[PDB]
Amino acid sequence: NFQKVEKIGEGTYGVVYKARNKLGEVVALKKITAIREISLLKELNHPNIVKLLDVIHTENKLYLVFEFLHQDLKKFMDASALTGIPLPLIKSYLFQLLQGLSFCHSHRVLHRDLKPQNLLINTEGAIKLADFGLARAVVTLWYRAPEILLGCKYYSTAVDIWSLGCIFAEMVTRRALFPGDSEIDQLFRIFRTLGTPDEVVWPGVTSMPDYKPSFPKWARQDFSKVVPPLDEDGRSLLSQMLHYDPNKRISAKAALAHPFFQDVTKPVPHLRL
Ligand SMILES: NS(=O)(=O)c1ccc(Nc2nccc(-c3cnc4ccccn34)n2)cc1
Questions:
Q1: What positions constitute the catalytic site?
Q2: According to the annotation, is 68 in a ligand binding site?
Q3: Ligand 1 pocket: which of 6, 16, 271 to mutate (most atoms within 8 A of CB)
């Protein structure tokens, strides 16, 4: 019932295509216990979440039909590489994404694999989270929370806050915060910046499945060196988004109340489609 327009990309759960509903709507068409779980996400509707319009199960084949947006944040960041995304827009995008996370997390749904590629933007200054709740139904490790890397089986909504903190830092500096090319390189990049975690800062860390007493012990670096020129409000918020202990890590709801957002606005981006 769809005429494919073009290949828009490829995901962890199969290829995504721009398509026209043959019988005029323009959509994103993704070709992938699961059915019921995905059907749950059809009701999960929020302005900063990419709407899942339909789920089609035909011939052992599964199709997810989403609302179509025109650009992802990876493409936008690359396009804004010369002068950087203006700070007020970074703040607007962070604020909106925290609203979306706050909504999903309140419904006990986590993303688990946030990255610039599944953050979608439109001409009006909105940004939306794509692929929410799918995980629970080369792969980038850059935005992976330390508890996942250390083998925690039962991670929490805190994993998404970590990923978003990483993305926030990337928008500001125009460089990935922790660009690991393997699981241990990812972990050790985190440790080299934030200090190797211990029982003081993260109670229970030394008993985690993949923790090794042999991990090198690196000292923590000051945030003024890690994300210039983020102001003190932004640095404070980021540090709370990157706490090692998931229970100390700021929630989306609490983050929205942080002083960093006192002067938040909704600018219109310069989008070249
Ligand atoms: N790369 S880009 O900037 O030109 C560009 C990217 C995405 C879109 N739209 C769009 N819409 C709805 C859903 C998605 C979506 C969800 N999961 C994935 C995984 C891979 C590719 C797209 N998506 N994508 C337009 C353009």
A1: 113
A2: yes
A3: 16
- The experimental method, as deposited, was X-ray
Domain coordinates of the chain in residue numbers?
1-70, 71-270
Please state at what angle helix 87-106 crosses helix 158-173, rounded to 10 degrees: 170
| Helix, strand, coil percent content, the chain, rounded in steps of 5 | 35, 15, 50
Q: What is the resolution of this structure in A?
A: 1.6
- Residue 152 and residue 168: Cα distance in Å, rounded? 24
Could you tell me the fold of the domain covering 71-270?
Transferase(Phosphotransferase); domain 1 (1.10.510)
26, β-bridge pairs: 20
Fold of 1-70: Phosphorylase Kinase; domain 1 (3.30.200)
Amino acid at 90: I
- Measured in angstroms, how far is the CA atom of residue 85 from the centroid of ligand 1? 20
The torsion defined by the Cα of 172, 89, 125 and 145, in degrees rounded to 10, comes to: 40
